[PDB]
Design a protein around this nucleic acid. Structure first.
Lengths: 63, 46, 77, 102, 93
RNA sequence: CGAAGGUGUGCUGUGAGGCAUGCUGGAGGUAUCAGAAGUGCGAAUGCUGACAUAAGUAACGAUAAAGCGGGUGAAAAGCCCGCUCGCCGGAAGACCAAGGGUUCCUGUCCAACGUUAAUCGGGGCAGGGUGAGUCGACCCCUAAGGCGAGGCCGAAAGGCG
RNA sequence: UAAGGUGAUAUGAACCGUUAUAACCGGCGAUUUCCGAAUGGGGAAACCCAGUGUGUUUCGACACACUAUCAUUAACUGAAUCCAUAGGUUAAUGAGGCGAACCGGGGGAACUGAAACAUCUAAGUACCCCGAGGAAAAGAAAUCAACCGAGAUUCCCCCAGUAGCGGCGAGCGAACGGGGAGCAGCCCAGAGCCUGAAUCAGUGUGUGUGUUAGUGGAAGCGUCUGGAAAGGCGCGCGAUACAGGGUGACAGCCCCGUACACAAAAAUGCACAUGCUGUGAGCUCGAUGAGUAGGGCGGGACACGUGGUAUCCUGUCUGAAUAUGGGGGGACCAUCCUCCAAGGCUAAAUACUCCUGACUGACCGAUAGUGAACCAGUACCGUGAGGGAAAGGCGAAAAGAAC
């Protein structure tokens, strides 16, 4: 009840897991090494997003 | 004078290392005493 | 170790007592020998380290009953 | 709950000036509140790069405790204590000796 | 295979951002620090996939962690792996 | 409207002691009568910390000695540059293995280490720097020796193989 | 539960959130790198090297799972050796290692005392090892008593520093009997009626009861000193709440609280017809644990040092009767009394605290109390086992001194 993941109870979660890793988390790492300002909360949000997606992957094997 | 300590990591490990302690029950007791004492270095060779 | 394997005799530690009642630790040892007994039902000789009292127990009871008790205890025969 | 809200018109009880009345700015986790224009103090600012380059003696409000700060009542112009009771899971802070919900 | 895009988490920092790195960028090679358990083929596939540029060879060295801490409190920095990514064909620099 | 503690003064009792008060201090003290003791220190070549003495005394670590000009700097015998002079040269030159572990390079600093000063440093603070199919390790193989399935032996542990 | 948060030294930067979904706390999960019993082989801890399968594949290769030893059981193959074993291979189950104290067993000292020392003592103590369990061990008389009787075991107070043992020295030291805590007895050696026939153990529930988050919780103002009031003074109120802690000095009424009342999605510990599954009721007849009791020799334990020494264990050599019978009653014999060894199981009273929570102290207050009030088994010292410190206090609030 504290957190809601009904938007990610869907199937085909592996493609958005891939979009979360490739060109999103990697881009935040490259931009953080170059030096950007708004990226700082975004790395934490993206890491929590991939954690949520991978827990739903461990919940349903259909994926 | 040659002094008593001439260091070598191979003989240091093969004498006073973790595998040398776990080979014998008395070395296992040595590690048990150091774990019960709370030391940061159980094995001083490693 | 020196175990009778039938009666379970073991080395038992005691004292040597002199005329002046000095005490020195000594060991009492069993009369153990390796002996092959002929078992008819297995049609073979079974070698067991046994005591003299174990051999008299075998002669009283039967080598079949003794090996049955041995299988009950679990010691290899 | 908490007897002191994020923005409540409150009256101090002890110290500095006793009688003065203010509104709560920030409630800290230590049991202290910053209230507007009560613990006025003159801190010294160092020369800092970009902002605060010349420095000064510019003023700030210090922290005062929730024990010293009491909730003011509009109906009766004095400090009033806070109780909270409601039958539902959502509670309401009610004034004492006035039976009015804050 | 070519190693998976999930397993291509090796590219940590794209630039060491140094005079030696800029000198070998303006002459020939890209200098960047990658992972701790990466292999040469892993860094090569990572460069060819995550960047558009094809790569000739990758040269890797492991950098030790500095102590860099005072007498009262003792600390040690993390050991990190650097790579020298050599890209000659199909390069823009 | 000033507790315990500290520091002087005055008074008092035979004594250990007590009382009052000026200054410092800025929160405790506990008449009287009982009760329990970690109940009194000058010694033990007593234990711990502080500080004297010798005393501004010995010493500043190979007798391979240095001199000058310029620069920087708050300050130069010691740092940098240059010209002489001297020393080693089967080393006091150069390269590894063991060992150490960042002492290597650059920028800055002089509080502590430098047996003096220090602008300097193997010192403090920040960045850098170690790129291998062929050099070592890893891996193939083995000596001494170690461990040793099963086994033999041994109160237990375990010993040998 | 919530208007505040993104743990601390530690500020910052970018952000999240309304009590209706930030953070915080609790139940159930998910992930859980590598080493470490380490278990695929090895090894100089946290590293090196694989093998067999499944799937993909850009031909460069990638992902995942399994692969240790021993014990039991089952299957398949199988020597000398004809049958058969030993062995080999596979599969299922189980074990390994750690941990402060208590417990049972296997070995077991010496310093010391005797004003020396050897019998004796220290002492079955220290230590080493094996084995568990929440307790362990013991336990339902071949037991004491004395001609009356008691009726398993354990633990406490007496008996009692008595009887006795003792280079009759030093010293060691009972039981009988009494008062108590607690207090139930059963099963096989064998067959029939009897066959879930009570009890007992496992397994999600049902109810009560806690545990692991919580909820509400009374009643003070004015004035003087003071930097600040909780202090002085004056007048009130609550109390099933005047245990305690903090707030600018000492607060019953400022805050957290406390007395009291209430609450558990979910998981769990104790108590019923538990539903079920297994073991197994009750009656009749029959039996009554052989290399055993006992003996000689050598030891050991009984308070008992072999002495007049009964009782228990047995290393060794022997060796009965077998309810027409045997054991004990402290050498031994007769009479008498009492009880059935050579098979087992068993709660409670009992010992202990690595840890969890609440409370208490004529306990300590930084040379004291843990070695450690401070980032302590840390810094240092040693090859190693090992040894092992010193180090608390600004202020109410950093307002931590702009210029």
């Amino acid at each position: 009840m504290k957190a809601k993941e009904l938007r990610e109870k869907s199937v085909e979660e592996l493609n958005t897991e891939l979009l979360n890793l490739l060109r999103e988390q990697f881009n935040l790492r490259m931009q953080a090494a170059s030096g950007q300002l708004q990226q700082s909360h975004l790395l934490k949000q993206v890491r929590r997003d991939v954690a949520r997606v991978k827990t739903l992957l461990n919940e349903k094997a259909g994926a | 004078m040659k002094r008593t300590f001439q260091p070598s990591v191979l003989k240091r490990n093969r004498s006073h290392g973790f595998r040398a302690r776990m080979a014998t029950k008395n070395g296992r007791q040595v590690l048990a005493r150091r774990r019960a004492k709370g030391r940061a270095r159980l094995t001083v060779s490693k | 170790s020196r175990v009778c394997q039938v009666t379970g005799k073991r080395p038992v530690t005691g004292n040597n007592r002199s005329h002046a009642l000095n005490a020195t630790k000594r060991r009492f040892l069993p009369n153990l020998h390796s002996h092959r007994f002929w078992v008819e039902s297995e049609k073979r000789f079974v070698t067991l380290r046994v005591s003299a009292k174990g051999m008299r127990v075998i002669d009283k009871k039967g080598i079949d009953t003794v090996l049955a008790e041995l299988r009950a205890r679990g010691e290899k025969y | 709950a908490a007897k002191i809200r994020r923005d409540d018109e409150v009256i101090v009880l002890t110290g500095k000036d006793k009688g003065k009345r203010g509104k709560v700015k920030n409630v800290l986790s230590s049991g202290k509140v910053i209230v507007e224009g009560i613990n006025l103090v003159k801190k010294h600012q160092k020369p800092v790069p970009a902002l605060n380059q010349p420095g000064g003696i510019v003023e700030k409000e210090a922290a005062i405790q929730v024990s010293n700060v009491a909730i003011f009542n509009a109906a009766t112009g004095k400090a009033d204590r806070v109780g909270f009771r409601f039958e539902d899971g959502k509670k309401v802070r009610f004034f004492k000796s006035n039976s009015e919900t804050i | 295979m070519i190693r998976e895009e999930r397993l291509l988490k090796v590219l940590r920092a794209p630039h060491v951002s140094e005079k030696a790195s800029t000198a070998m960028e303006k002459s020939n090679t890209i200098v960047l620090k990658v992972a701790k358990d990466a292999t040469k083929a892993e860094i090569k596939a990572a460069v060819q996939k995550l960047f558009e540029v094809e790569v000739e060879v990758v040269n890797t060295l492991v950098v030790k962690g500095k102590v860099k801490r005072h007498g009262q409190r003792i600390g040690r920095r993390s050991d990190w792996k650097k790579a020298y990514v050599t890209l000659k064909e199909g390069q823009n620099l």
